């Protein structure tokens, strides 16, 4: 398996062996521009994500259509991975050409805890998808009532001590 697939599948012992030399191979893009970290993030492989970040993998890298580790983790509702990436100062509002942001993806997947985490770290609630929907618009239109409540509780705090 490629290093990308080793990362995706959480084959960490094998991944460590491939990386042994410790050069820029950690950030190697595949044919679509995905790094091992993006693959691990997209599959919720927390231990592999932790290892890659601690090794020094660049969490900011965008793939060929602007996909990021943060947006793919958020799409899958992987709150703990989202938190790990945000501790490395990734752009919480990263936009990609599919039209979204981490917050939009977390809302679209009904990922309550991930929405909560993104808002707690200051993700922008005003930013519309290219489709014209804000995160609240999506939550309301889709009937995701707990997501709606989480958004409402955050909005409360924005305007009150």
């Amino acid at each position: 398996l490629s290093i990308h697939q080793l990362a995706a599948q959480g084959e960490l012992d094998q991944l460590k062996e491939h990386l042994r030399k410790g050069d820029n191979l950690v950030n190697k893009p595949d044919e679509r521009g995905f790094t091992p970290l993006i693959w691990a993030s997209a599959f919720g492989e927390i231990e592999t994500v932790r290892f890659l970040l601690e090794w020094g993998a660049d969490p900011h890298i965008l793939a060929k259509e602007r996909e990021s580790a943060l947006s793919l983790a958020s799409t899958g509702g992987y709150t703990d991975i989202v938190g790990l990436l945000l501790e490395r100062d990734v752009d919480i509002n990263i936009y990609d050409w599919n039209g979204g942001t981490p917050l939009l993806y977390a809302v679209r997947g009904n990922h309550v805890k991930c929405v909560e985490a993104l808002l707690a770290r200051g993700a922008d609630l005003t930013t519309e998808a290219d489709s014209g929907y804000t995160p609240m618009d999506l939550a309301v239109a889709l009937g995701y009532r707990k997501v709606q409540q989480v958004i409402e509780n955050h909005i409360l705090k924005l305007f009150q001590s």
């Binding site: 995706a8 599948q9 039209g99 889709l142």
Partner: peptide
């Protein structure tokens, strides 16, 4: 075993 990168979802209401 070669796993497939998930898509970023559409941000409209298509497919609910």
């Amino acid at each position: 075993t070669l796993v497939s990168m998930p898509p970023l979802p559409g941000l409209d209401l298509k497919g609910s």
